[PDB]
Structure formats: structure tokens, C-alpha cells
């Protein structure tokens, strides 16, 4: 995974936890959009965000993100057990000339 | 609504050729902006893009595996076929077929995903 | 086949006045009823002249469009315009875009003048959203199609301001791309080609224009990129240059300098022969006069004292207002000849009582007699 | 030896429209298939007119090039232009050059207009890499040789922008010296000398030009020096001045002000006599019309909403697009007279059905009759 | 009021006049008093943070 994400982040219930997806001048810096996916244990990936913040049908408004240069962030407000999934970022790389995914991060709640 | 189903052998011997087929409903590969892509996820590992085919029949493959991969589509039957050659134990992973939107940008996203068909190489 | 005669009749309104806010009309919080209209120099003024019936046909052989207000230059802006950074003389690489990076920006407008005269309403072209959906899926946020639309220009429609003749209402959804006076309107530009092709010349038998503009500043946008720059055209950077800056650049117009010598108004016209088959005949006893004049678009601010019990100055004791004064005076010379539009908003002008053959008693008549 | 007659025929397209991105064409990540073409005012437009056969020869005695879009000024830039520092009014000595010191810079372009008419394709001169290798070793990074090349101008080729008529693709390898729209293209300039020398006048029997420019800023480069400054021309410094600054200076052009009075278009021409032997005869039933007009090169930005579920503004919810509207309308007057190019990309224009002798029904015909 | 002074049929108010005036915008400025006719909510999207206060 050319894109890098922290292996895991822990947050308390109801707290605003954040995730990071660092890139480079070839994937994120070049202006290619970034997308996110959540995958529950034993299920297929589900679309979460599709241009840095946008929210598809069926996702609570508590999910958002922003562009911070050669990086992107996912923000979760009101942490619950629904957020015990694995999150992946996706983008396009011009050098490798492929679509790439990140290393994934295992969000956990201190219940 | 729009759905995808995967099918294929769950066990394939090494150095053989794997074949997988997907069936999609609710959309066609003739509408501009509609595309289908193949992804895989080895156990306890991150997702990895493999290939992609679009309405104009243009095909895309991963550079690390371009020679081993070929894809095709059949609009009249709403099916897309993947074929990987020279299999290896490392390739044992779950394969998902997903629909894909075309952007004016080049960073496409796969909104719906299939159930996922597991493949083992041994 | 039209026979001309030596009978002439002078006419005119002698005054036409309008007042209102230049940016947006005033009205109650949710009511759609207007209290103060919107009046500015960026709006077309289409005067639908209702001539008297000669049988109880006219031929407009001369016209004069008087303007009374002093020369001036209007200013328009947007409290939340989309402007990332100035790139004319950037000395350090742009650092952050942020969630919202809109700035309070102001700017003058492309100076423009015109005067269209004809027996049919004028025609105006703009760039609106296209019809063709065919067999292409409209993906989230794709580029809207473009189409060359043709319409009829009405009084109150905006003019081209150097941002392009386009329907900002639909093509731009963020409402921050252009100043407040056009962020939700249609900036049309006359389709001179079609209006002179029409073989009859009804749409107009006389027109003038004089517009000018220069780039006063160079600016950049801040939205997410659409058609990204090809990797071929640049070498990937690193460090500070790792994150590309937006390549969507827009100019800020400027009309330069206003002068009396560059005025087409307060000057007579003589429509002896038109550029079309029709030689100025007023079929149906009607006329249309479309005029634009950004050379007198000075907005006079008004200040009113809420309380007069303060020894010292306080911003929380005065209310600021903006109003625009529009003054007009149409004069016409008509010649005697022997041989469905209610959908639109025009400025009706009745002339069925203001006809007199005493040419010398009026200035335009004196000029006509001299020439 | 060509006999003229009193037979005339008006012709024209009545509309010619184009749309696309002004900087670069759109296409799939690695595919070379274009989805949206590249259209801008900096490109030549060569219309290859396919006349009908008079025997089933023509003489172009008049032409009119209609332009419909509003006047405006385009803006071009480069997210990673090579620009070390501004030296117009430097008050402190430059400190560091660094590994990468490129800045997001924008700039308008030299205003230019032209209209070449002839029976053969036009000729354009630029400055490309020279052929002669002879007996000289090309050392690493040596200065490429320069040669005065001659070519044929095609539709889509760029025009001189004040950076010089040169082949930026080869002469400049870093792709950061000039804006994005020319960093990988050829900016040709017509070779008027050769095209009038040709004794026949086939390459053209009429031409016009009006271009202007001024220096709006003074900039410096940052690459490693080539031909270093001689030690004779300066006294060695010390301290802060110990490290010389680059002596490679480039200007940023500017076209100043656009006006209607400075327009050569929407105005008829009368080619009664050419500047060559040929007096406007259309040999082979063909014509070429090359036109440039940077006076209407306004780029209209488009904004599309990805999601409409946000109460507040967010840059990550709108996509920015740039498109350019190019409109044309060619009119011709032809006179009757009695007595290998498929390699290039031209804008084919068919006129074999649009010939009519009803001159008065068209504007150009009315003008011709008047004159 | 050139219009009224030439309308008058006698020309007494004047029988000769000239004028030559010119102007250009040298700077763009803003006021600071309390707002009167406020901007409609239709013409803009509400901001936040720094842009919270128009």
C-alpha cells in the first residue's frame, strides 16, 4: 500500500477520533480525489466518502473529511460500536499508473 | 437494486489458470460512466486492485501482474470474466467485484461491492 | 413598396426616473413582495414604445437617448467570493486551502455601452446547461454540458461583465464564483449575428457598441479539482511543492477610464437606411430600445442616524444604505408612410399623446432641421 | 490572362461552434483517446474551404469573419513555474535557491489578432533544435543548437505569447519555463517574409495583424548557470553578496486593454488586388483562413455540486471546471472567372451547397452592393 | 441638468456649453456602519469559523 495509514487508533465513546492517510506528490498532491471505505468483520467493503467529505445515502452526518495538503483526514463524531470497523483510503497514482489502497486502520472503542 | 454476484472455483492447483465470473443487475456496461473492477484482499492484509474494464471496452491491469491478467465483458449477458494465469499460494485471497463510476478526475470509486468469493491455491 | 412622405412628428417622454438597490431587491424575510426594486447600470433597459395609430405606418428616422446623471464608475463585490490566493507575483508557495477560504473581494466591471433599435424584441445568447442526456450517466459532480441558448432580452436582465455570458444560476452551484449582483442571474450578450442574418431587419435596424476591459488582478480558485493536469506537462516536486496548487485561474476585470469623448449617448442618430430589407418601418406601432450604460453607474451611499445622544462616534449608531439613480430621456423623430409578448417584462412607455409637429420647439427637431 | 465577369455568389456557414478545456485536452488515465478537446483563443483556426466546382475558377473578392462571444481576457498559468524571485524592486539580497523553488504563477498573454487568406496553407517559423552535429561532442547539458524552421500552420497550433516563437517541447526539458498551455507545444509565428516573397501570392493575398504587449513584472530563473557572467563585468563581493544571484531574467507579458475600436473582425474586406501576381484566384477550389483572436478568450468556470446535504460551505463539496467557448461565422463573396495535404489537421468547412446569388438577402451582400 | 436647460424652448438658460470629464477607480474600499438592507440568504451559502461573520 503506497498510501500510509496508522495501524490502529483507539477512542473513547462519544469522543471525536480522527484518522490520517498520508500520500505524496503522485497520488494526493497531484489533485486526485480520495475515498474511504468501512469493512465490518466478515463483510465486504462499503463506501463511506467519495470526494474528501461527501456522504452517500445511508451514512450518518457524523462522518466527514478534509484535504490537508499531501494528506487527508476522516473525522468521526459520536463514537459508537458501529465504528469498530476497518477503514481504507483509496486514490490514483500517476507514477505506478494504478488505483491504490492504504494499509487500513483498526478503529476500536474503549468500552 | 444494483447487485453483484461472484462465482468460481474455491480451490485451484498451483501454476494453473483461475477463472472467475460476475453477474450484475440494475445497470449495464453500455451506459457511459459505468465500469466494473476486480479487487482482492488476502487474509489479514489490505485491499489490492487488480483490473478494470469500462463501457468502451478499454481495460486496465496492475503493473505488477499485467502479464498474468486478462478481462472481458459481455453486455448482452451482464457478465464479466477474469482470468489469472500461473497461480501461486500467495494469491489465495477473497475477490470482490464492484461497480465503478468514471470521474473527470482519474480517482474513481467503487460504491457497491459483491459478497466476495474466496479462492485458495494449493 | 413603402411610400415616404415629408411629414414628421417629434415625440419624447421628457423624463424617466428609477431608483433602488443596485445589488438585490428589498423584501420581507420570506415574502416575495418587493419593497425596493433592483436598479443598476449593468441591467438592460428595454423600452416598449406604444406609438399612436397613424390610421386613427410610422418610420423611426431619428433617435436620441439622453442621460442626465454624472459620469461615475460602479463597484460590485461579494463578501464570500471564492479566491484562494493571488498568483500574479507569488513569492512563497501556497500552504493551506482549508475548509473555507473565501474572502471579501470587490471589483469594477467591464465598461460597456450599446443602443439597439428595432420593431421586435432583441435576442440574447448565453451558455446554459445542455439538454442532451442520451445514454450517459450523470455521475456525482460531473461537468454540466454547455449549450448556446437564445432568448429575448428583458428589462432587468444583466449584461456581460467580463466573466462571460453564462447562466450562473445553474452552471455555478456554490454561488461564490462571481459578485452578488450576478451570482443568481443570467448575464446575456446580444447575438448580433442572428439579429442581422434575419433578412427583414426587424430585430434591429440600428445598433452601436463600445466596450473595453483589462485584467487588473490574477486570482485562483479553491474547490476540488475536476479535469486534473496531465502528468506529462510537469515534473513531480517534493517538500513544499509536493502538493500542487489549483490551476483554475480567473481574472478580475476593470473598465479603465470613463470619458465624455467616449460617449455614444446624448447624440442624435439618423436611420436613413437600415442594414436589412426593412428600412426602419414600425410594424404593429411598436419599438424596442435596449440600452446599457456602465459609465454612469455610481452608487450613492446614504447614512441615517439611529440615535443622536452620543458625544463620540459609534458604528452602532448609523445605518449604511446603497441606492442607484437611473435617469433617461428618449426623443424620437417619426416619418409617415402610406402603403404575444405579454410573457416578458418590459418598461412600457406610452407616446400616444406626446406627438407634435412643432419640430423647432424641441432640440432633436432643431438638429434634424439643421441636417 | 484570367477573365473576370459580373457574376457573384455569397456563401457562409452561418455558425461554427467549439467547446473544450483551454489548457489541455481531457482523456483517460493512460489512454490517448480524447473526451474533451482543447479549445482556446491562443490557437490558430485554419478553415479549409471546399468550394463547389464551377465547371459542374472562383475568385474570393470579399470576406468577413464574424465573432459573437463577448470581449474578454484569458488567463494562463503554471502550478510549478520556475521563478526564483522578483528583481524589479528587490530591497534585500536573495538568500537561498534550494532544491525546488517553483511557485504557482499566472499571467495574461500578448494580445494578438490576425487573418490570413490564400489558396495555399500558411507558413510558420519557429526556433527548434538544430540538425548540425558535425564533429562536436554533445557534452552533458550543453546548449542545444538553434535553427530557423519553417512549417505549415495547422488548427490547434499555439500562437506567439511574448515568450518567443520556439519549440518548447525540445528546447525546454524541465517543462516549467512557460505556462501549461505551451509547456509542451510549438508557438509558431507567421513567416510573412517568405509568404510574400513567393512570387505567385498563393500562400496569401490578404493579411492583417495587430498585436501589443508590455512588461508587467520582472522575474528570475533558478536553474544552474550555463554561460556564466565574465569576471570582467563585476567586482567580487563578500558577506551577503558573496553568492551571486542568477542573471537569467524573463518578463511576464501583458496585453493591456481590449477595446471594440481595436477590432479587425466583424468588418468586411475587399480583395480587389493582391500583393502578388495572383489576384485572389482560388486554384483547386480551395481556401485557407487562419485567424487568431485573444480579445475574446474568456474562460467561463463551472461549478457542480457533489452533495447537497451540507448546511455550511465546504470546498470538498464542489468541483471546479474550466471551459472555453469559440464561435465563428464566415461569409464570402466569390466571383466567376473563365480561362497532398491530408497529412495535416484542418477544420474542414464544406460550402458546396451554401452558394446563392441573392446577395441582398445577406448582410455581406448588402455591404458589397453598397460599395 | 442639461436636459431641462436645453428643453426650455427659449434657450435663455444657455446658448452655449461644453464639458469634458473623466475618472477611473483607483482603489476599492468598504464601509463599517451597521447594515441596512441585508444580503438575502439566497445569494450565499452560510460559512463557519473565520467566515462565520460576514
Numbering used by the authors:
A (entry chain L): 2 to 9, 11 to 27, 27A, 27B, 27C, 28 to 95, 95A, 95B, ...
B (entry chain H): 1 to 35, 35A, 35B, 36 to 82, 82A, 82B, 82C, 83 to 100, ...
C (entry chain C), D (entry chain B): 41 to 96, 113 to 395, 454 to 485
E (entry chain D): 247 to 300
What did the study's authors say about this model?
The HPV virion is composed of an approximately eight kb circular double stranded DNA genome, encapsidated by major (L1) and minor (L2) capsid proteins that assemble into a T = 7 icosahedral particle composed of 72 pentameric capsomers. Twelve capsomers have five neighbors (pentavalent) and 60 capsomers have six neighbors (hexavalent). The C-terminus of each L1 connects capsomers by an extension, referred to as an arm, that bridges the intercapsomer canyon, forming disulfide bonds with the neighboring capsomer and returning to the parent capsomer. Although the C-terminal arm has been shown to be immunogenic, most antibodies target sequences encoded by five surface exposed loops (BC, DE, EF, FG and HI) and because the amino acid sequences that form these loops vary by type, antibody responses tend to be type-specific or weakly cross-reactive.
Cryogenic electron microscopy (Cryo-EM) revealed that two of these antibodies bound five Fabs per capsomer interacting with all five L1-surface loops. We made a complex of A7M08 Fab bound to the HPV16 L1 capsomer and obtained a cryo-EM reconstruction to a resolution of 2.69 Å. An alignment of the two structures, including the L1 capsomer and each Fab, has a root mean square deviation (RMSD) of 0.8 Å over 2050 Cα atoms. The resulting antibody, created by coexpression of the mature A7M08 heavy chain with the light chain having the predicted germline CDRL2, showed decreased neutralization potency with an increased IC50 for psV16 by more than three logs compared with mature A7M08. To measure the relative importance of each amino acid, germline residues were substituted with the mature sequence found in A7M08. Both the Y49F and G50T substitutions substantially improved neutralization activity compared with the germline sequence (IC50s = 4270 + /- 1028 and 908 + /- 230 pM respectively). The N51Y mutation showed the greatest improvement in neutralization compared to the predicted germline sequence with an IC50 of 198 + /- 78 pM. The hydroxyl group of the germline Y49 could clash with the aliphatic interface between the EF- and HI-loops. The structure also showed a potential mechanism for the A7M08 Fab susceptibility to BC-loop mutations. A7M08 instead has a bulky tyrosine at the equivalent position (Y97) in the CDRH3 that would potentially make it more sensitive to mutations in the BC-loop.
